[PDB]
């Protein structure tokens, strides 16, 4: 998952950094926007 | 149980119908002999010649 962000500094290591990374990569909902097969058909 | 099923992430989905994903395998092979002939015609047995 997503780690926790709640830390101190000296815990925000480089593990902690590259798992913020690889959830990012793993692969979308927006409240005010439509989805992304609505706007390229648009295009 | 909640700290084990808190352990891996959440995909939404768009709708409420079934869901897949593709699985794929190679292109490389190898194909199995059925039986094997001479010039003429007859099938090469077992106890036959070169």
Redesign the interface.
Known sequence: ??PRQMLPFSKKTKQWRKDCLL?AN??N?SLVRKSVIHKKINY | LDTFLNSFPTREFEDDNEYYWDVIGSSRRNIPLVEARDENGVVVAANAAN
């Open positions: 998952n997503f959830w793993q692969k909902y």
